[PDB]
Structure 1
Amino acid sequence: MEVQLVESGGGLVQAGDSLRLSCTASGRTFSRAVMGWFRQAPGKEREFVAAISAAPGTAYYAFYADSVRGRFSISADSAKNTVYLQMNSLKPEDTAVYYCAADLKMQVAAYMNQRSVDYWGQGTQVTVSS
């Protein structure tokens, strides 16, 4: 089987700055699974960040962790089978390895248990400088 999720983007930014990440999904996964993002902060277990409903075309639900509400946003481009993670007003505390995830057992954007994730993209380092 070919890799389901492929991540793009990352790097070092300054506090207050913004950065958007992206991830492609196979046609099949893009339409069947809830897709979302996780982040693995230094020395900590990866936490849920954001989720978007399955097959996010013209309309969809989005859901967020309290710690990123209003600052982070998830969206999609069905044409490119791609989902995005917009991160505004980054703080040093957002420094983490960012992971995209799919869960075929969910349809509506919600909290994702990492134990239930069917596929992961490769983690990407996002560093926010003080």
Structure 2
Amino acid sequence: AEVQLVESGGGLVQAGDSLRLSATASGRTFSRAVMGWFRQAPGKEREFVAAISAAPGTAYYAFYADSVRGRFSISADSAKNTVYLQMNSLKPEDTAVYYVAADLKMQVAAYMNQRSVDYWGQGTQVTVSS
């Protein structure tokens, strides 16, 4: 089925700042999907950043790549049909286009392979000047 995921929040920013990305779907969406964020710079491999999935009640499971642990946080709001990535202590090496992703086979937040991702958004440029 067609799903149109849309990222928002990208910007030009300074080393040591914060930026918050969000993503939602236009029309058809998911319930109980493992959602994630990936990133890539021209010529680079697309790299996994963070994953999130629904737990009991209002809780979620999260999982972070080592490159962002201690700095980025992934959250979600099911009412608002939106997934978030709060980026803190941004470094020039965080410069990339950031993509929201959904993998429909996975059952719980974990490391995500770009190769297994079922749905991608269009991407939002994040640029960190030193």
Give me the TM-score of the superposition, normalised by structure 1.
0.91
**Is contact 2:32-2:54 (8 Å) kept?**
yes
Structure 2 stretches of 5 or more lacking a match? none
Range with greater deviation from structure 2 (42-51 or 52-61): 52-61
User: RMSD over aligned Cα, in angstroms?
Assistant: 2.0
3-state SS of 1:93 partner: helix
Structure 1 stretches of 5 or more lacking a match? none
**Is contact 2:13-2:127 (8 Å) kept?**
yes
CA 1:42 to 1:72, structure 2 compared with 1: closer, same or farther past 3 Å? same
CA 1:107 to 1:94, structure 2 compared with 1: closer, same or farther past 3 Å? same
3-state SS of 2:28 partner: helix
**Is contact 1:31-1:54 (8 Å) kept?**
no
Partner of 1:72: 72
CA 1:23 to 1:123, structure 2 compared with 1: closer, same or farther past 3 Å? same
Range with greater deviation from structure 2 (53-62 or 32-41): 53-62
3-state SS of 2:31 partner: helix
3-state SS of 1:115 partner: helix
Sequence identity (%): 98
3-state SS of 2:93 partner: helix
**Is contact 1:52-1:109 (8 Å) kept?**
yes
3-state SS of 1:68 partner: coil
Aligned length: 129
2: distance between equivalents of 1:7 and 1:55?
23
2: distance between equivalents of 1:27 and 1:126?
26
1: distance between equivalents of 2:56 and 2:30?
8
**Is contact 1:22-1:84 (8 Å) kept?**
yes
Alpha-carbon distance, 1:3 to partner:
3.2
Alpha-carbon distance, 1:41 to partner:
2.3
**Is contact 1:31-1:55 (8 Å) kept?**
no
